[PDB]
Amino acid sequence: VXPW
Amino acid sequence: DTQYILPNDIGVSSLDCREAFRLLSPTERLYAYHLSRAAWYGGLAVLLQTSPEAPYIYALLSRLFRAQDPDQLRQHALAEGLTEEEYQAFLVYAAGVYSNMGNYKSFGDTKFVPNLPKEKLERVILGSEAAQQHPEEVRGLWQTCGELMFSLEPRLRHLGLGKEGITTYFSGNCTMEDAKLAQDFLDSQNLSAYNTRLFKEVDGEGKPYYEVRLASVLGSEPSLDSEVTSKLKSYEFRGSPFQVTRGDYAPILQKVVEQLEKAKAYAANSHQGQMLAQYIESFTQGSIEAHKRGSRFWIQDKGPIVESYIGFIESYRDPFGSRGEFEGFVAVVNKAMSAKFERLVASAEQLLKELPWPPTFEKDKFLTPDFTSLDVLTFAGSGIPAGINIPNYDDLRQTEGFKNVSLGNVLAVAYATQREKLTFLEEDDKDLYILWKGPSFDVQVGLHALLGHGSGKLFVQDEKGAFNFDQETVINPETGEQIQSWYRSGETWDSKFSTIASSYEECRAESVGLYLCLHPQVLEIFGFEGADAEDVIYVNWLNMVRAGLLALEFYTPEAFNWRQAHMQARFVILRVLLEAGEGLVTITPTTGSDGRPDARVRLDRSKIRSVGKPALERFLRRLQVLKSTGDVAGGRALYEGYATVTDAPPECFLTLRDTVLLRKESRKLIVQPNTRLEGSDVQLLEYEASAAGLIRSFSERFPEDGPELEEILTQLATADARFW
Ligand SMILES: [K+]
Ligand SMILES: [Mg+2]
Ligand SMILES: [Zn+2]
């Protein structure tokens, strides 16, 4: 799993 | 309107990684070169996983820009009557298509079209140099993809199952019912959806036949024996015919495995070599199991200088939530920035104990997980994240361990903001925001990756009832009773929690981040003692509530659907903190300095611990209990209840959404470098931080076989054309  | 176009002054940042590359040894450089080539090759498949016209648009753009670079093409376009702003809009559009590997935003799942008249762009394309060199190919590509490149018909605006959306993970005639039946079949067959797509056709009667196509180099022909070759047959499932095939994106993955084999020669240790062999197996046969074994060997490779991962990893853009989009990154460790995260790992096992659920709902043994800060050289696919927790195989995450990764040169590209663009904050808040955003983000990302995704025990039952926990002694804190819900064989987190799984897990991880950020030991791990940890905490929470407001841009009210997992998660956290009342967070609509509707977010620093922490603790316990029991019913109840967007007073979120859109800022595109092999050495090629720079980065990206990749994509597109 993992914004700006 | 502007919702479905990229603005001509969209920010473009260049990935900064000359120093990390210059650190690398010659062997490490050739290793990263071949891995980057494999990743770039595989990222082309995202085009096929995005929209039916995306491969054609890519082929057309890359042909156009091979014939003429942006500056050559400008002269033609302006001689053909375009304006500089229209040509700039075309450049921005091409750069968007390149940066997303498709004509839909990877962050938002919305289509974007070129911001200029279609007839003028036709004048440009048909008069171009590539058109004069290949009239048949260019004219065919244009007639095939042009109006779809521009059409904003309402069913084309968003990615999604059914008729009101667009997806190529399924055929056009597929609905959520078809995806649910496919997922039940896949669970019954212990075949993971990650590297699969689903196509539905009908016979003369109208009876639906289902094809579950696996992504593989090899097709449906006799190859060396695998667990995959037995599965290539027809089945009947609840009266429906299913056909498991493979050979999807076959020549693309062929290039990928070529480059992976070449990288295998320059591997540092046997862990990397075996993980690469297993990746080759996974991509050639179609085995998610081979990818699992490669990921196991990869977890075993601790602290390498060139970190990497590749495959059909994340399941964000599958409208059902189980199939994986292709990605692949190559990065260099940054030991100085990784120091703080290894520090966070040092006290991580003892940090988990503070989480608001009993150790019976926590992983059995804490495995010392690798956590590095990385500098990216390549991140192929549709988007570059800030950090990753991988692998997503929860069995591996519970037995062997996992890796946490913080992309440093991506965090740095995203750190910069201007005062004007910081919307919905009062001037007193903006200064603390500017001063503390970066360090607060280090904190939040560390907590999100290590203690968020890295925490949680899923209760799995065997086929012989062998619970991985103690059914007799483990008690459910929300009911006081023993455990009654759990996962079975073949059932995974994505499998049971389909459309909300990504957003739900993300919400849990970032609630963990917000919660454990009050812990002063954590704040001193990042070197923030009480003199400044105060402000880093307040900034983390203010950023969270502001993100919860801003998330309304990523909500389709007509479909009652959330288009982005993290933003839905942050809206959920905002509604949760609004729920406790007591004047903690307050969204108040105002009128802006420019005379347009604005809003203001007020967050009280004092009530963060007295009001915010109890609500977050309650919420985290609910989330974790429902996740560990796999209670899809109650989990959906909770999450889809908080994620509900309503115009109810006082918040009036639906009216706020118009303000959030009317003051939205487009996410910047990121230019990535290329690597070249001068026979002996490896050199790094950087590019201007512009639309033309990104275009050039993709024109020089495939020097050996670019025109062949264009035709591979065109062929794979035309073959499946009947599905949409
Ligand atoms: K998912
Ligand atoms: Mg659809
Ligand atoms: Zn995450």
Numbering used by the authors:
A (entry chain F): 1 to 4
B (entry chain A): 3 to 726
Which lines from the publication concern this structure?
Dipeptidyl peptidase III (DPP3) is a ubiquitously expressed Zn‐dependent protease, which plays an important role in regulating endogenous peptide hormones, such as enkephalins or angiotensins. DPP3 cleaves the first two amino acids at the N‐terminus of biologically important oligopeptides ranging from 3–10 amino acids. Upon ligand binding, the lobes close encapsulating the substrate completely.
Not discouraged by the lack of precedence, we proposed for our DPP3 inhibitor design to incorporate a hydroxyethylene moiety instead of the cleavable peptide bond, as a noncleavable isostere resembling the transition state in peptide bond hydrolysis. We were fortunate to crystallize a SHE/hDPP3 (E451A‐variant) complex and determine its structure with X‐ray crystallography. The binding mode of SHE can be almost perfectly aligned with the binding mode of tynorphin in the previously obtained structure of tynorphin‐hDPP3 complex, the main differences being around the catalytic zinc‐complex. Arg669 also forms a salt bridge to the carboxylate group of SHE. The equivalence to the tynorphin‐hDPP3 complex is also apparent at the N‐terminus of SHE, which is also tightly bound by the same three hydrogen bonds (Glu316, Asn394, Asn391) and the salt bridge to the Glu316. In contrast to the binding mode of tynorphin, the hydroxyethylene group in SHE does not interact with His568, which most probably presents a significant penalty to the enthalpy of binding. On the other hand, based on the initial rough model of binding of (S)‐hydroxyethylene type of inhibitor, the hydroxyl substituent complexes as expected to the zinc ion, which was confirmed by measurement of the bond length from the crystallographic data. The Zn−O bond was found to be 1.9 Å, which falls into the range of 1.9–2.4 Å for values typically observed for the length of Zn−O coordinating bonds in literature.
